[model samples]
Structure formats: C-alpha cells, structure tokens
Target: TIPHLAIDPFSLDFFDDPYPDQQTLRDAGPVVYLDKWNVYGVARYAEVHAVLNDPTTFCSSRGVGLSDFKKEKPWRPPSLILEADPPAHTRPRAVLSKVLSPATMKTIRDGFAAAADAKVDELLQRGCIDAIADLAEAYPLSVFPDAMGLKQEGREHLLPYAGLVFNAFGPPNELRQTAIERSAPHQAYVNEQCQRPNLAPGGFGACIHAFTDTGEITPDEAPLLVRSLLSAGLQETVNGIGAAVYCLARFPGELQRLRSDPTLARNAFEEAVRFESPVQTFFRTTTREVELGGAVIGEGEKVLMFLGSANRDPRRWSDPDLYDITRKTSGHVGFGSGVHMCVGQLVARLEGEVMLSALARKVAAIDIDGPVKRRFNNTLRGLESLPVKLTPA
Candidate 1:
C-alpha cells in the first residue's frame, strides 16, 4: 500500500513555508497518497520527472488541476493548449512554439533589455524600493504586454486574470472561489484584448492571428490561442524574477558573484527557479493502472507532482538547497517538462536574464532593507513585497 498522509498541500500554512513538509513528502515514499485531496503525490525527482515526461499515462486533457474535467465542468473553457491532449494540443502547441521560439525571443531581446535598463534607472533613483512592486511586477507588466500588443486601457486586468487562472488549479477552496468571483471583469477584459483589432500589427497576437490565413489554425482558434499566451506569460515571469531577487538578497555572496560576472544571469535565474520553484505543483490524471514506488495507482486518479520538492530532492543535485548560480540546472522541472513544457519559457527567461543582467551590471550590492512579504497563490511562490536597498556600482 502507498504511504498515506493527511496533509493539506494547498493550505496557506504550507505556502508560508513549504520546505519541511516537502521533505516529509519526498522521504515518505516515491508516490504517497494524499488523504486530504485523495490524490497521489510524487515528490522525488525520479518519479516526478518520469510522470512529467510521460504525459500519455499522466494526461492533461481531463484538466491539469485537482478538479478533473471528466467529473465536472471547468470554470472557464479549458485552455486549448494547457488542457488538451495530443491531436487537439498539437496544432496550438506548434503555433505557440513558433511564436515563442528562441528566434522570436532574439527578435524581442533589445525591447526587453531597453525596458530592463529603464526600470533599473528608475529603481536607482528611488534608492530603497519594494522590489516586488518596483521590479518584479513592474518589469514583466511593462514589456510583455507591449510585445503582445495589448491596449493600455484595460491592461490592469492581466495579473488578476492570471491569478484566477493559477488559483483555479487547486481545490475549490476560499482562494479559488475568491479569485473567480473577483475576476469577472478582468476575465472579460482579457477576452476582448485577445481579438485581432485590439492587437497591434507587429505583435505576438497579430502573428498568431496571421496563422489563420495559412490555415495553420482557424479564425476561431486564433484568439483562444492568444488567450493561451496571455494566460501563460505574465504572472509566472513576475514570480520567477521576484524569486531570483529574493535569492540574491538572502545569499549575499551570490549577489556579489553575479555583480562580479553578470554573464551568469541566465543560469542564476534558472537556479533560482530550481530553488524557489515559482510554479509549485501541477496535477496530472493517471490514464491506466500504474505501479509507482511499488503502489498500484488506477486509471483516472489525479496525481500531484511537487515540482518545488523535486528540485530540492537530494537524490537529484549535490547541495540541492544551495542557490548556486554556477550550478548546472539543466534537467530541473520548474517549468514542467515534455510536450507541455511552458510555451512561454523563452519569453520568461528573456525577462529574467535582461532584468538580472541589468541589476548585476549597475548595482554593486543588494541589501534587504526591511520585511519581505510572501504573495500567497495556490500554485505560485513569490514575494509580495521585497524591501531592498540597491547600491549602485
């Protein structure tokens, strides 16, 4: 029998500080039955990695959340990309893969860099600032929407809508209900913004819409595809950057190392993703009877993969807890893996790299000036406010 634990993984207590219980989950077994949610949880690197890679057995079509779509209707139309399996997922995934490809990121690199430099200039002038408000949230909100060609009028809805999207991934608790109730206007705004007329001619949205002419995707499929991008982009980038800055502030030597050689910014961000794991847990539905960690899991069971724990599993890395920018973090599943690996990863990485590189180049020191507040989301881990003093180089 699989080891069972009566723990609430999505509770605010777990989000406040997840490590201890994460360790408990990892050491408990390869796959433990979560009594609270009646889902199987895999926290070890090997099993988490295997489950993520084998998407067929652990599928996404039934919804990549605790509430399986097969059992109940989704609050919103399921994501054409994130919630569909193979043939249905393939077309949209291919279009997005091209839109967010490394080549596309290269084309947009200068825009990201310019925005990063401008943000740093403003931060330096402020002397002491809340990194979350000033840097983390501000940076992505500034550059990403512009690239997506979104109108500025209703732009404020992006984050709230994103908050609702990720929150809906957990059990229908207070957080999910509150987010859904509060997000009605934000959701409508996002839907309208995904339209062709609302999108600028040379932006990512227009590019996705253009695919309709070639019949790569349909006129009806285009806006939904744009919706997919907006859904996937903003919040994760905000959290990832916030997580990186927090890591550097707490690990002063690492900040010094980054300042000494700003070239490490990419790996630094990657390592931070591994350590903080901005997007914490994702649920997958088992499609068949599977033997995992000696436990027989039946078809249609929801299996939760603890990405944060897998990144820190000692079985995967030497000094797994340490935030080492120099560490090679290639196989980390912070972004998820397989066919469903984050489509916006290159965009997110570009934002992080540009911002971190800018900070490293212009700032000599990153000091925690006061209290750090955590932003609680069911699937994301990040700072709400990071009070920091940046010393210019």
Candidate 2:
C-alpha cells in the first residue's frame, strides 16, 4: 500500500526547511499520497523522471497547479506553453524554441559579456553587497528588459507578477490570496506591455508578435505569448543566479574550484542548480488509470512531482547533497525534464554562466558576511537577501 503522509508541502514551515520533509517523502515510497492536499507525490529521481517524460499519461493540460482546470476556473488564462498539452502546446513551443534557440545566444554573447564585466567592476568597487539585490536581480533586470523591449517606467511590476503566477500554482492558501489581491496593477502593466505598440521594435517581444504574420498562432496569441516570456523568464533567473551565488558563498571549496578553472563557470552554475533546485515543485494530473511503483492511481488524480527531492535523490547521485562543481549534472531536473521542461532554459543558463564567469574572474573569495534571507514562493525558492564580501583577485 502507498504511504499516506500528512504533510503540507506548501506550508511556510515546509518552505522554511524542506530537506527533512523531502527525505521523509523520498524514503516513504516512490508514490506517496499527500493527505493534506489530497494529491499523490513522486519524490524519487526515477519516478519523477518517468512521470515528466510520460506527459501523455501524467498530463499537463488539466492544470499544473493544485486546482483542476476542469473543475475550477483558472485565476487567469492558462499559460500557452507551461500549462498546455502536446497538440495544443506544439506551435507556441516551436515559436518560443526558435526565438530562444542556442544559435541566437551567439549574437547576444558579446553584449551580455560586456554587461557582466561592467556589473562586476561596479560590484568590486563597492566590495560589500547584497548578492540577491545587487547581483542576481540587478544583472537580469539590467539586460533582460532591453532584450524584451520593455519600457523602464514600470519594470518593478515584473517580480510581483512572477510571485503571483508562481503562488497561484498551490492551494488557495494565504500566500495565494495575498498575491491575488495586489495582482491587478501588476497584471495590467504586464498586459499593456505585451501589446505590439508598447514593445520596442527588434526585441524579443516584437519577434514573438511577428509570428502573427505567419499565422503560426492567431493575432490574439501573440500577446499572450509575449506574456509567457514575461511570466516565465525573470524571477526564475533571479532566483537561479542567487542560488549559484549562495552556493559559492556557503561552500568555499566549490568557489575555489571555479577560481582554479574559470571554464567551469557554467558547470558551477549547473551544480548549484542541482543542489538548490530553485523551482521546487510542479503538479501534473494523471490522464488515465496508471500504475507506478506497484501502486495504481486512477485517472484525473493530481500527482505532485517534488523536483527538488528528485535532484538530490541518493540513488541517482553520489553525495547528492554535497555542493560539487565538478559533478556531471546532465540529467538533473533543476530546469525540469521532458518536452514540458523549462522553455527558457538556454536564456537562463546564459544569464547564470555570464554572471558566475565574471565573478570567478574578478573575485578572489566570496565570504558570506551576514544572515541570508530566503525569498518564499509557492513554486519557486530563492534568496531575498544574501550579504557577501568580495575580495578582489
């Protein structure tokens, strides 16, 4: 029989320190019933990977959140890519994939590198800084908006908008309610910015709009597609870069490894992602009756995949909890797995790589100067404040 765990994975208590609960969940069984939310959870690496790969059986269309789209009204229109299934998801996914293709990274490389150098130079001058605000949030906000062709006036809405989007993925708890109350202005701003007139010509948003010309998607979808870019891109990158910086600061040995070989800058970021697993969990509904780990789940059951737990599962990774920059992190689900995996992964990686590379080249040591404050969200994990002292190389 599957274990029935009376745990609330979305609670602040769980968010404050989830590793213990995650271990308990992983050890209970491959498929455990989460009593609090009446959902099934897959914590082991093998199970999580299998569910993510078999999107047909463990589908995304019903809703990737606790609320079933079939039963409850979505708080907003569902995401074109993130909350969609194969046939419906294909065209938007193709458009976004091409827009953020690896080939395009080369064109943006020199510009991103220059921005990184300048940011690092500014940080080195300051010496003491909040890595979250000064580096993680600052670097992305500086470059990403320009790339997206957004106006500078109301850019502050981005993070709050992301907070609402991610929090809505959980049950209608206080966190989700609070985020909803303040969502109006942020939503309005984002919606306005998604329109063609507001978007700068030759930017990512305009490029997405261009697809309307080809009829790949309807004229209406163009704006929502732009909205997809806004909703998926920013806060995740902020948290990811913050996670990498925090890992390097907390584990000096890993920092030293990167310092010895700067080429490992990208690897350092990937390892940190595996260790941190910033985007913690996403929900997938079972489409039909299915058996997992010798247990059967009926059709339309909510299956919550603990991505963080899977990334750190002992069976899949040796010394899984250790922060090791040299570890092979190829199959880690930090950015998720399978077709519904993070669509903006290449862009996120580039941001992480450039920022870490710049820090590795310029800073001799990154020592945590004070208390680290974690930023809480229903589906995302990151730092609110990370104080650090950077010694010059």
Candidate 3:
C-alpha cells in the first residue's frame, strides 16, 4: 500500500531547503508520488542508483529538463552523449572518454595545480578575497579555456552561459527568464566558438572536431557535443571548488585535518560534495510502469532524482547531515549512479583535488569572515559569494 504523502513542487519552502521533504518521501516508501506535479520521485539512494543505471527502464530521451522533450520545445538539440542511451550514447562517450583519458589528464595536472596554487598565493597576498570569484571561478576559467583550446576572443562568457543553460532545465520561472535574458547577448559568440575552425589546437573542443572529421559523429553534431562538454565543465568546477571552501571554512576542525595532512584534500572534496552536492537534481523518464517507494510510476512520466537529498538521506547514512571527511562516501550518488553516471566525473574530481590541495598547501589558515551568499538555481547547488581571510603558511 502506498502512503498518501503529498508535497508541492513549486512551494517556496521546498526550493529553500528540500532535505526534510526528501527524507519524508524516501521514508514514506521506495517511490513516492508527488500529487502536485503528478510525477514520481526516486528519493532514496537505492532507487536513484537503479533508475540512473537502468536507462532501458528509465529513459533520457524525453530529455532531462522539466519540460518533456516529446511535448515542449527543446531549448536546444539534446546532447549527443549525455542525453543518449546505450548503443546510441556509447560511441560518442567512448571517443570523448579517450580524449579526456587519465593519461591525457595527467599530462595537464601539474600545470593546472600550479595555476591554482599561483591564484591562491595571489589572493593570500591580498589578505581578504571572495573565494568564489577570486579562487573558484578564476582557477577553472583560466585553465579550462586553454584546455579546451578556446581562443582569446570571447571565452570569458563560458561560465555565465553554462549557468543559464543549467538553470533553464527547470520550469520557465524568473530564474530561467533572468538567465535567458542575461545570456541572449552572448549566445552568438558562444555558438560560433563551437565551430570546427574556431577551436584552438590541442584542446578538447579541437579533439571533438577531429572526431567529427573522422566520421565518429557528423559535423553538424560537433558544436552541440562541444557545447555539452563546455557547459558541463565550466560552472560545476567553479561551484564544486566554491562549495568545498565553504565547507572547510564553516568547519574549522576539517581545515586543521587537511593542514595536518594535505593528502586529505581529495577525500575532503568528496565529503564536501556529499554534504553540499553541486549539481542538485536531474529528471528521468519512466519507460514503463515502475514501482518505487510503493508508488506506481506510469509510462512516460517524469521522475526527479534529488542527488542532494539522497546524499543526505539519514536512512542510508549514519550521520547523514554532518560533514565528516573520513566517512566512507565512495558509493555516494553525488556524481549520479549507474550507466548515465557523470562521464567526466574523473576530470571534475581531479580538478577539485588539485585546486583544494594547492590552497591547503599555501594557506596556513583560511576562515570565512563574513556571511556567505548562495546563488539560487533550479539544478545547481551554488554559492554566489564566500568572503574569506587567508593567512600564508
């Protein structure tokens, strides 16, 4: 028997803090039906993992956004890789995976680490800095452009454009409207950079064009694929770094732990992600009648997987809400689970580890001196400002 646990999808309370509602729904059953939206939710870790892995039953074809791609206007063509499944999603992912392989990433790791260290050093010298803009946003923006081989003309728009696209995944509310309006002026320049000839040599974008030339994907698909990598890469890197700093700042003991052993930086980043997931929610379509948490999800209905909620579900985690760096967070759904799991997750992990490690090495003590402000977006758990005072080692 399914529990009659009703929750509003558009209520302000849900938007402000959704963990309580998520736990209620998860405890209510394996799959709880949201009466307001007439949709189902896979609120628990097990169900969320199952749905993400088994794409045959849970399809991405309807698109991952709030609007069903089958019915509404798709803001853009679906990602050739991210929004694809199995055989269709396999080839592009394989090619891109090789291009961003561990070997290739290792080659650039030292350079990225140095860049992050230098940025932190400069900020530490200045004494007070907004970690989000000065360190988090600046580190990725500097390295990733050169990494993607984006030229100097107008690459600065990457972060803003990516933020808009991610926010547009939700209902077309004020946040989405504002992002769209803000991004309109730069859309042309962003689109043009996705072109083959415009890509810089030895970058991921150039490699994607190379794949297109080799007939792996059509030339027409090149821009969208490159755009997908760019959008996926930029903002999340900034958010993850920013969120990690916020966690370390709020919890001073964790800072000392990392200082005692800089090697803890990687685990620290993972724990921070476990505490405050950067990419919060993504939707999946039910291909058939699927039962979750005692609720029956009809075919073609959308099921929202709250990664942020599942990360903090007390049912599965011992001290779920607490941020503990030593917790065995390996199987956590911070990166999504199963087959549709984040493809470039390794890249993200490396970036976070490198940036944080560099900061930990340089700064003897780092603390949040003022209030932190969050940037509200439907799909991303992001910080707008984290002002900190960094003292040199």
- Candidate 1 has what TM-score? 0.98
Residues 1-393, model 2: lDDT tens digits = 999999899999999999999999999998999999999999999999999999999888889999999899999998888889998899999889887888778778778878988999999999999999999999999989988999999999998998899999989899999999989999999999999999998778988988776757888999999999989889888888998888888898888889889899898888888888888999999999999988999999999999999999999999998998889999999888989888888888888899899988999999899898987799998989999999999
Candidate 2 residues lying further than 4 Å off, grouped into runs, are none
TM-scores of the candidates are 0.98, 0.98, 0.95
What are the C-alpha RMSDs, in order, of all predicted structures?
0.9, 0.9, 1.8
**lDDT (Cα atoms) of all candidates against the true structure:** 0.91, 0.91, 0.80
Candidate 3 per-residue lDDT over residues 184-225, each given as its tens digit: 756777788899888888888888888876656777878888
CA error at residue 231 for candidate 1, angstroms = 1.0
Ten contiguous residues minimizing lDDT sum, candidate 1: 209-218
C-alpha lDDT of residue 363 in model 1: 88
The alpha-carbon deviation from the true structure for residue 297 of candidate 2, after best TM-score superposition, in angstroms, is 0.6
lDDT of 2 at 86: 91
Q: Per-residue CA lDDT of candidate 1, range 1-393, in tens?
A: 689998789999999989999999999889899999899999999999999988888999999999999999998888888998887899889898888888888889998999999999889998899999989999998899999998889888898888889999999889998998898898899999988999998889999998887656899989899998888788888888998998998999999999989999999999988998988999999899988778899999999999999999999999998999999999999999899998888888889999999998998888999998888888888889999998888
Look at candidate 3 and give me any clashing residue pairs: 29-293, 30-292, 30-293, 31-292, 31-293
